[PDB]
Amino acid sequence: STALAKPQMRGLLARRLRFHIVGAFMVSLGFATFYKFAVAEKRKKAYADFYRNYDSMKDFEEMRKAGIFQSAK
Amino acid sequence: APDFHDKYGNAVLASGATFCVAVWVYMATQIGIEWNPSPVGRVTPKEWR
Amino acid sequence: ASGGGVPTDEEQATGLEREVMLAARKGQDPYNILAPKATSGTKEDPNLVPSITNKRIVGCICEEDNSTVIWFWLHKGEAQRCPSCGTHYKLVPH
Amino acid sequence: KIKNYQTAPFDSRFPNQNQTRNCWQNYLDFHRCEKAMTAKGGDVSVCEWYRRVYKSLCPISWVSTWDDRRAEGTFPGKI
Amino acid sequence: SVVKSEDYALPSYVDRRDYPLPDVAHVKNLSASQKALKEKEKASWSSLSIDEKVELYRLKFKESFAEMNRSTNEWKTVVGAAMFFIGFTALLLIWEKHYVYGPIPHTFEEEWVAKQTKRMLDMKVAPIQGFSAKWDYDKNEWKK
Amino acid sequence: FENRVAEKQKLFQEDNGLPVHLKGGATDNILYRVTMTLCLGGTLYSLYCLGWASFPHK
Amino acid sequence: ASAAKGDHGGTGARTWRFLTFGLALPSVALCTLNSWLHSGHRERPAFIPYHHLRIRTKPFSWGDGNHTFFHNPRVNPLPTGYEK
Amino acid sequence: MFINRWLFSTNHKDIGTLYLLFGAWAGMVGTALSLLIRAELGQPGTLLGDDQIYNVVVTAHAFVMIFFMVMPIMIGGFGNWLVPLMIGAPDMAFPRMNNMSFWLLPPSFLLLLASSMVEAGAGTGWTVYPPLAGNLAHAGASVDLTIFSLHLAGVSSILGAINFITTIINMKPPAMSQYQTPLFVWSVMITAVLLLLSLPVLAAGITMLLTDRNLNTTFFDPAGGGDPILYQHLFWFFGHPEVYILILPGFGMISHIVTYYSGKKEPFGYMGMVWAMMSIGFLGFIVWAHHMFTVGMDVDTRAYFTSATMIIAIPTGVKVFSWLATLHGGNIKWSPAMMWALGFIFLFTVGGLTGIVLANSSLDIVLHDTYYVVAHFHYVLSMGAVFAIMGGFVHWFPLFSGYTLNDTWAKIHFAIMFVGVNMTFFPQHFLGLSGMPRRYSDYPDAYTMWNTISSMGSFISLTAVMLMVFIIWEAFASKREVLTVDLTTTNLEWLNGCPPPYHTFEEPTYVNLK
Amino acid sequence: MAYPMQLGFQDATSPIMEELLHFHDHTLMIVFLISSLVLYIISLMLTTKLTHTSTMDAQEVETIWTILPAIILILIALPSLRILYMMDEINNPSLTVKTMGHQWYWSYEYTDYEDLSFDSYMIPTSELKPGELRLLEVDNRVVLPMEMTIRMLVSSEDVLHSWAVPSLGLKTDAIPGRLNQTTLMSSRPGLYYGQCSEICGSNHSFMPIVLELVPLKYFEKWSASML
Amino acid sequence: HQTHAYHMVNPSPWPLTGALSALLMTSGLTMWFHFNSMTLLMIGLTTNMLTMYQWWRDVIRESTFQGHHTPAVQKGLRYGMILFIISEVLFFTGFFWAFYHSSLAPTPELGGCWPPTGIHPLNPLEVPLLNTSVLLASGVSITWAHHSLMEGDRKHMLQALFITITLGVYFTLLQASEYYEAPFTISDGVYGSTFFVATGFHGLHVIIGSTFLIVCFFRQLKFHFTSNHHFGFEAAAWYWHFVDVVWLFLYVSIYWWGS
Amino acid sequence: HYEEGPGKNIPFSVENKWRLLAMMTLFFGSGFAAPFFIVRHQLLKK
Amino acid sequence: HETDEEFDARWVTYFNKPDIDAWELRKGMNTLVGYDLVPEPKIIDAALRACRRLNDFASAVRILEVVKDKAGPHKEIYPYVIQELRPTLNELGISTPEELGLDKV
Amino acid sequence: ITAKPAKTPTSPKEQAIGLSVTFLSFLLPAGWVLYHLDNYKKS
């Protein structure tokens, strides 16, 4: 017994595009944050932590005692 | 009227997928290919010097 | 000094070159060197498209500076319309 | 301004990756200086800086070929 | 009905959902009963039967929208056949491994690899992330 | 000299179906046959030379 | 810009013939004079077997392999020096 | 009659057909060479036991694919068939010189085959750098035969360029301006300008190499005051324009394909597309030394070449986004040619982006002469130039032949090829980042896993190539004759039917000026 | 050296190589984002039955598609060029070492003080000692002091070669008649491997580079013993 | 029957003979350089000349005798010749780049100087200056020939064109003599290499251009040209001016600045 | 004139699909085989 | 550049032209469906009445089909448009595609 | 595009023959060379 309401009829393709370009942008920001955390910052911290108390002579003596060098026995 | 895809599509999909997986798994595992995976978590290091 | 002895095109042009030259003097363009100028293109005043056969391809630049040209065969008989802008064209065989 | 030589220092005349002319110029300078000294009776020791620099920078085969050509009279640079 | 190669320069019929009213009718020649149907169409369409209305539609058009837009099972054939041919490719690769390739170098022997792995750890290959970083030098085992 | 272009125009416009490279007459055919024989014979000789040069010899 | 002349107004064959005989060919004649006054051989320099000259990485495909195409015995030494 | 028609042709369609047949045969040669490369690398150790032969195979692979497959198919094949039809011209400007551009290529290819059969071949790389290519490290005839092969291919393409530029400038309808010609026609004109200017510089450089090898010149030999690096400049002053020559007709075909199967009357942003191709062509002449970032150039020169190279991304990006904007709102027809073009858009974009990585000369120190470069350029060549060729071939095969392909088989072919090329080349990025050099016949053991996968990929693409030949056979075997083609109002090359008559536009189109 | 199934760069051994890793991470994030955005937009264009086939005005949107890529390129170029000029910066070496390429091996000359030079050839696979690396070991390694700025000069006595050590971020072509300079500084002791990187004929694959980085005092005694 | 103005060319064998002549000349140079034999090369040179003669003969038949060169066709040939000249400019540009590369950065092997140690350049004020006056003069005389033809003057066209050709021959004979008299050779390092290859390709182009002028001379004697239609003459004059301009760049660069 | 139409504007016959299969097999097969036989040739020379 | 109401009014006027011919009917509908919209009922009404003046029942049905097609996945639009057209469909004796079975594949 | 039905239909069996012949034309000659590589390298 009930009539149907008038739906939006115009600009449906443009509306879809706008909505999903915005969503693509939001995802891109979400990805850049994930990648900075999971890759770029991770790498910066791995090198910083590695070198913070790194003892190059101790490293050398370990290598030398393992027998790896031509010039150092 | 049904066409080739209605008549044979299901069989082509099922048989082709089954064949493809079977032969690549065989190739990958049964004929001596050396993939040389990472030793990490796999190889026990052994004295060399 | 200045003598003659060099033929002119009027004297010595031949073949298709001579046909084009003689037609140009008459203001005629049988070999399609010039762009035809459009009429208003109504059904009453269609663009008249010469042909030596009973159909010819028309390209319609519907509006000035459109980069898209609309191409279609125009056949002998009743005027036809460009499918994009509707402007009328009529074949005039021979 | 005497010894303490470790290696050839940066030379603003030759700041780029191609160091060919640095080797060549110091080789020339050493031998021009040596020619001047041995002539007028002086001491080649004043030429030593050029000698150390070109020995540091120049491939052994380049020095060797240039020395042979000086001996042959076919060295194309001016000394 | 019958489209001929020599008709290529004439206006033609097409079923395209973006060109709903094509340049020609699907059927140009009419029988006696079809002519009478086109005459009847000049009167009230409420007096046409359903069958007459369908017939007028099928004189004008070949396929309806639903027919021209129907989806098909073609994807099954395409994907299955592609997998078949990729599978055939592994047969070629099996043939190559058997008849073309000889043994690989002795450096891939298990004992060589174990010794080479220890030597890489002794020289701290990629000790920041790539390789020796994954070895626990205190516990003498791969990190968990 | 005298202008004999009109005679040449009549010759090369004669309605005889000949292509322009033969339309001067029998001398065109001879020159064409010489050119094509040298080209095709020379090409075969080049292939012979390839065959010779493809193998070690001396 | 230019060097100074005149002419013009509707240049044509007469002006270009004027330039040919009045400027261009006199200039060729003057340079021909200048050249045939400075002709005559100069002394060839001492031969020095410089390694950047008289290059031979492959024999030449004519002669004995060791003579350049327009070899002039008077002024072109071989790698071993001037010919006798 | 057969000789007159097929050896003495003055017809743009028949000559285009000759080029397509030649390029397809060359593509088989180039593919076989590529499979030998990947067979040598498919497990650790040596397969051929002769790395001079490996180096000859690599070198010939590149020359065949570039000079005998891509350029003849895109410019000689699609260019000759389509350009006169797309402007309503009755043939090319110089229809007889056009036939000599074609017939110079079998002799050029014969010289390249001769180079590989005599002595030990030219195992030089397709760059042919001295002194490796000089007469001490490559004594004997092989390198000179390669040089002469390039000379004949170069003359063929220079005269072809003259023909295409003249035809496109001079033989349009009098009302049609250059901004009313289709984008494929633009892409061919710009390619031809790049060929005209760049190939003479290559010709000069390889002639200097010929005289250093045979007349005792020393352009490239320091003993005479010459310089190997001068050869590299001359080579790459041509070689960077050359890669834009290889892709530009592909860009033109992709524009037509995307427009057509989107159901559009026109590409999005036509004048932006013209601008972008012109900008790419211009910038393509001022970036060459990014092929030389490790030779020892001054830092400021490296900074300039980094910056100029990166600028090319801006016009290229306009074309990619304009293709996407052509799809936008389309009535999408998922034809096989559409699949090729969609694969093109994405995979070309991936390859162009790794080119931007390489443009940074600081990183290029570590990536130069590694497989990261090989991965980059096979994304733009094996998945851009080749995908455009396959798209164009499937799309226009019914015009050229009058017969239809089986679309299901063509989609199967696309699917197999897509898997194969990505399995082949994607892992090469990892090999390059981790330091594997290019032009190697064997590798340190660590690199085994990705080389194994890459070589398995190469066999998938082989299966696709074999199936392509069968698909062509089945079309000619079944003889399904074309009836109706849609969108002829914006695709003039179809309007004379399939195939068009030997002579088309004997009466020119009527186009008024208004 | 590389290790099995490696995806990215060898770990950095020098500060410049560490800079290159961070710059690559920055650039690859941009590469991933643009490639993924294009793939996504493709998929978006292709997944609706809605249509719009009439002419579309391009002016407005081409401003976005030129300006935003230009900004991104500047964001790549700025750190790119910073590293380029940091590489070039004056370092003041305390040692110069020459290397000459040859078919097919490298020679090294250390002639700051004494006439020290030797050849360096790949160890054949059949002569590797257990645990050694196929195609990478050499008989005579390039011993160098760690933690010191070293000038390397690179040339060739025959065809082009190229002297590379990826974990130090080095690659310098070896050109006859030319002496190319690069600088090397290892933050750590150890063994760092590279391979000839300009095709030089039939054994291009088989003339590797091995640096051995040790304390200065060990380098001095090694140098003396190699005379 | 066509109703456009373009030329549908009869099927022709000369593209194929030209392509095969290229195969024979290049395989012939290879045989001469490596297998001590001139045979293939002489066949290739002969078939090349035969091909050029019959092809350009046919173009004259198509135009003067058959009338196929409408204005539209002539306009295409103008573009074609201009584009051909542009490609030849870029070919010479590579040799100038080689010259400036070597002379601006002279290497140690040369003495680190330009001209190299042991090179005694020709005096640019003697025969090289004469050659410059000769080609410049010929650019004036060919312009006189062009205006005489446009003005319908057969005798003075022939006179001016003959003077132009005589000057081209004079240049070629002077250059041949200079080559013989030069104390340096093509094997004298990069100085001889750049000098002879660049001036040598230029001299080849002078010979080509002179031949083209001679073809125009005999066509003029046979009345082929009209006062308005004479593109072969125009093309030969453009090519001749190109040869003159290349010479001026060689003179300033290699003979003068490079001395 | 020349023959025109499908199957007539090509230098090879498509009148018999099996003869066509043979001809296409020889054509594409010869191009694909050639590099393998060039490698064999070079291997056998030394 | 132009309001929605102005656009719709131009299209109503186009189809309402009493002597609109067949070519103009097809040109109108084939142009209209290129736009990013489903035509308002008042436009479709005028087009259907043009079909009536042109004695073309089949094109009236096709026009209803292309309304449904332009709505894409928005399944609510076509039943709304048919609802709004019901008085016109009844007056002119136009059967819908669904009533004719033409929605079946 | 539309098109006529095949003038000379190629049945499934015919396609299997054409495909098999095509594949063998590529595989057999290269397979023969690669199978015999060792024989060549022993020369």
Ligand code: HEA
């Ligand atoms: C079709 C062939 C082709 C094409 C078109 C290109 C395109 C590019 N190439 Fe590639 N390249 C090759 C084929 C090609 N290349 C070959 C064969 C080699 C090796 C030669 C050899 O040594 O043998 C090579 C080598 C090569 C090098 C040398 C690396 C080395 O040897 O160390 C470099 C360096 O800069 C380079 C860079 C680029 C760039 C910047 C582009 C640009 O034109 C790419 C532009 C495209 C995009 C960027 C993608 C689309 C853009 C967008 C979606 C917009 C937004 C993007 C951004 C903001 C970044 N290429």
Ligand SMILES: CCCCC/C=C\C/C=C\C/C=C\C/C=C\CCCC(=O)O[C@H](COC(=O)CCCCCCCCCCCCCCCCC)COP(=O)(O)OCCN
């Ligand atoms: C004489 C007055 C007019 C000058 C010009 C005369 C003829 C030149 C003809 C053609 C030249 C073209 C190629 C140039 C190659 C070198 C020739 C350079 C000019 C020349 O003639 O150089 C002579 C040496 O010639 C030599 O080696 C041998 C020369 C003969 C063999 C040449 C073979 C090489 C051919 C290569 C062609 C490649 C073309 C490629 C075009 C590609 C287009 C896309 C110099 O003689 P010299 O004794 O060394 O010194 C003089 C000492 N008194």
Ligand SMILES: CCCCCC/C=C\CCCCCCCCCC(=O)O[C@H](COC(=O)CCCCCCCCCCCCCCC)COP(=O)(O)OC[C@@H](O)CO
């Ligand atoms: C050791 C020496 C070796 C030498 C080898 C080369 C030898 C010399 C070749 C010299 C070139 C001769 C060219 C002759 C061309 C004659 C045909 C001609 O000139 O044809 C003219 C058209 O021009 C046309 O095609 C113009 C056609 C273009 C001609 C271009 C010629 C120059 C290029 C030659 C090749 C150079 C290669 C160099 C490579 C390193 C005909 O039209 P018109 O003149 O208007 O006449 C019509 C009127 O009569 C009507 O009233």
Ligand SMILES: CCCCCCCCCCO[C@@H]1O[C@H](CO)[C@@H](O[C@H]2O[C@H](CO)[C@@H](O)[C@H](O)[C@H]2O)[C@H](O)[C@H]1O
């Ligand atoms: C595609 C472009 C191709 C460019 C054309 C190249 C043509 C090359 C022809 C060379 O001809 C050679 O000239 C030499 C002149 O020096 C001759 O030397 C001959 O004559 C000399 C003295 O005149 C002596 O050295 C010897 O007796 C003898 O070899 C030589 O035999 C002869 O063949």
Ligand SMILES: CCCCCCCCCCO[C@@H]1O[C@H](CO)[C@@H](O[C@H]2O[C@H](CO)[C@@H](O)[C@H](O)[C@H]2O)[C@H](O)[C@H]1O
């Ligand atoms: C990179 C491209 C190559 C891709 C892979 C090729 C796949 C293989 C196709 C089969 O090739 C055949 O294989 C046979 C072996 O299966 C060979 O027979 C050989 O081996 C047989 C069995 O040992 C003997 O009966 C024969 O005489 C002997 O020639 C035969 O010559 C060769 O044509």
Ligand SMILES: C[C@H](CCC(=O)O)[C@H]1CC[C@H]2[C@@H]3[C@H](O)C[C@@H]4C[C@H](O)CC[C@]4(C)[C@H]3C[C@H](O)[C@]12C
């Ligand atoms: C024969 C001819 C007259 C014109 C005609 O009637 O043919 C005349 C006029 C111009 C003359 C030529 C020109 O005067 C140029 C040359 C002048 C030289 O003194 C003789 C040869 C030379 C090449 C002349 C030969 C001949 O006498 C020509 C060609």
Ligand code: CUA
């Ligand atoms: Cu040495 Cu590659």
Ligand SMILES: [Cu+2]
């Ligand atoms: Cu590049």
Ligand SMILES: [Mg+2]
């Ligand atoms: Mg390199």
Ligand code: NA
């Ligand atoms: Na290998």
Ligand code: NA
């Ligand atoms: Na003129």
Ligand SMILES: [Zn+2]
């Ligand atoms: Zn219009």
